[PDB]
Amino acid sequence: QYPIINFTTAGATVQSYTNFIRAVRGRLTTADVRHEIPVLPNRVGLPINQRFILVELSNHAELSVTLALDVTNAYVVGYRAGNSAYFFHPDNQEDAEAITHLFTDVQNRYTFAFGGNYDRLEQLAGNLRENIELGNGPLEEAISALYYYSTGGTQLPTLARSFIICIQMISEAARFQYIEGEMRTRIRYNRRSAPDPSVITLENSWGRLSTAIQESNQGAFASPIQLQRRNGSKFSVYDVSILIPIIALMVYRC
Amino acid sequence: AQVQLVESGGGLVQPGGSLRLSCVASEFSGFTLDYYAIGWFRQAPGKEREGLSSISSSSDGFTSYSDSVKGRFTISRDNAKNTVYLQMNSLKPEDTAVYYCAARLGGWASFSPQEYDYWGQGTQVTVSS
Ligand SMILES: [Cl-]
Ligand SMILES: [Cl-]
Ligand SMILES: [Cl-]
C-alpha cells in the first residue's frame, strides 16, 4: 500500500501548504543528487511497490479525492473518488501494467482515451494555462469537480481544468520551489490568478532542464535553455547554479 | 432531508427599474448555504435555460457574470439568513424571463445547469411599461 500525504484546502495557510509540498517531495525522493539537485528514481527496474505515492485532498464541504503521482516524474497519473477511479491514458504497456496496482479495491476502474499532458488538457478545458486561475479556491473547486465526475455532475472541460489546477499546484510545485513560492503567494492573499510566463516556461522546460543539468560539464550546460520572465521577455539559463533555488526534483537521465 | 431552495422577489418592473431576487435555503438541511455554490439562470419560452451569475463555494468569494448582465447584476450572501441574493439593476425588456437559482455542495461558479444539484421553483420577471 503506497504512502499517503493528506492536504485540506479548508483553512489552508501558507504554512500548511508548505508542509504539504515538503512532505510530497520527501516521499518522491529518498537522495541520488546530481550537481546538488535531487534526482527522482529511475523508471527502469524500479519495483512496483515503490512506483507511486498518493495525495488525499479534501475541502470544507468534506469532499475528498485521492490523486496518484508517479515517483519517476512526480506527475499525476489518475485519481480515486469513492467507488470509482480514473487514469490518464498510459504511454506504453509497461505503464499500463503499473497502474493496475493502484486503487486495487475500487469497484469501477476507467482509463481515459486521452493523456494528461497540458497540450491535451488545455484543449479539453477550452483554455490555456495562461487563462486558468490557480489558488486555494481553485484547488477547493477542483477537488469538488473531480468528486462529482463519476455521478455525471462535472462537464469535461471542467474536469480538464481541474486536472490542470491539481497538476500545477501539486506536481509542478513539488518539482519547482519557484512554483511552490508562486502558489504560496496566492494562498497568502487568498487571491486566485493564472500562472504567468515565468511559471509556464519552467513547466514546459522541466524535462529539458533535467537533461541539461545531468548532462552538464561540471554544472555548465552544453547548450543554454531559454525561459521567459513575467513580461514575456526571453532569457537563457547556462548553468545549474542559478537553478539551485528554482528546481527541486529532476526526472532521471543518462 | 435534502436542501430545498425557495425563491422570491420577482415581479413586474418597468425599464430602468430594479428587483432583488432571494434564494433561501430550508432549515434542518445538514450544510448551510455558505458551503454551496449558487448559480442564477433565466429561461424564456423559446429559449433554453441560461446562466447569468454565480458565486463559488470557495472562501475567496469568487463570482462569475455573463456578458449580458455584468455591471448591472450583483450576487451576494446573507449567511445569517441562510440566503443568497441577486440584485438586478437597470432592467430592460429582454431581461424578461423566469429566473431560477441552483446550488451545489462544494460547487464552483458555473453557468452549466448540469453543474448544480438543487433548484429553486422559479420566479417570473417581467420588464415593460
Ligand atoms: Cl475549502
Ligand atoms: Cl511532464
Ligand atoms: Cl475517454
Q: Is A137 annotated as a binding residue?
A: yes
Nearest residue in A to B116, CA atom: A153
* Among the bound ligands, the one closest to the CA of A117: 2
CA quadruple A130, A136, A139, A143: dihedral, nearest 10 = -160
- Say if residues B97 and B42 touch (Cβ distance below 8 Å): yes
Distance (angstroms) between ligand 2 centre and the Cα of A2 equals 21
A108 C-beta neighbours (distance < 10 Å), count: 12
Judged by CB atoms closer than 8 Å, whether chains meet at B105 and A191 is answered as no
Chain B contact for A137, CB < 8 A? yes
In our burial notation (b when 16+ CB lie closer than 10 A, e otherwise), range B19-31 reads: bebbbbbeeebeb
Which residue is catalytic, options A27, A34, A175, A186? A175
**Cα B101 from Cα B109, distance rounded (Å):** 12
In A57-215, alpha helices (H):
93-99, 118-125, 136-148, 156-166, 173-175, 177-188, 197-204, 206-214
Domain boundaries, chain B: 1-129
Question: May I ask the CATH architecture of the domain A1-174?
Answer: 3-Layer(aba) Sandwich (3.40)
Active site residue A118: yes
C-alpha cell at A230: 513575467
- DSSP secondary structure code for residue A44 in this structure: T
Judged by CB atoms closer than 8 Å, whether chains meet at A140 and B58 is answered as yes
Q: Is A27 annotated as a binding residue?
A: no
- In CATH, the number for domain A175-254 is 4.10.470.10
- DSSP secondary structure code for residue B26 in this structure: P
Largest CA distance in chain B: 44
Distance (angstroms) between ligand 2 centre and the Cα of A216 equals 21
Q: Which of A102, A193, A81 is nearest to A145 (CA)?
A: A81
C-alpha cell at A37: 539537485
The shortest CB-CB distance from A61 to any of B35, B110, B112 is to B35
How far, CA to CA in Å, does A119 sit from each of A6, A74, A114, A128, B36? 28, 18, 11, 8, 32
**Cα A68 from Cα A146, distance rounded (Å):** 13
C-alpha cell at B124: 417570473
CA distance A125 to chain B (A): 14
- DSSP secondary structure code for residue A3 in this structure: -
Question: May I ask the CATH architecture of the domain B1-129?
Answer: Sandwich (2.60)
Which residue is catalytic, options A86, A118, A147, A149? A118
Q: Is A136 annotated as a binding residue?
A: yes
**Cα A37 from Cα A39, distance rounded (Å):** 6
B85 C-beta neighbours (distance < 10 Å), count: 20
How far, CA to CA in Å, does A87 sit from each of A114, A127, A234, B89? 9, 22, 36, 47
- Say if residues B101 and B21 touch (Cβ distance below 8 Å): yes
Domain boundaries, chain A: 1-174, 175-254
Kind of pairing, strands A4-8 and A52-58?
parallel
Who's near A138: CB < 8 A, 6+ residues apart?
Answer: A132, A165, A169, A192, B58
Q: Is A75 annotated as a binding residue?
A: yes
Distance (angstroms) between ligand 1 centre and the Cα of B60 equals 10
- Say if residues A230 and A202 touch (Cβ distance below 8 Å): no
The domains spanning A1-174 and A175-254 adopt the same CATH topology? no
Judged by CB atoms closer than 8 Å, whether chains meet at A145 and B112 is answered as no
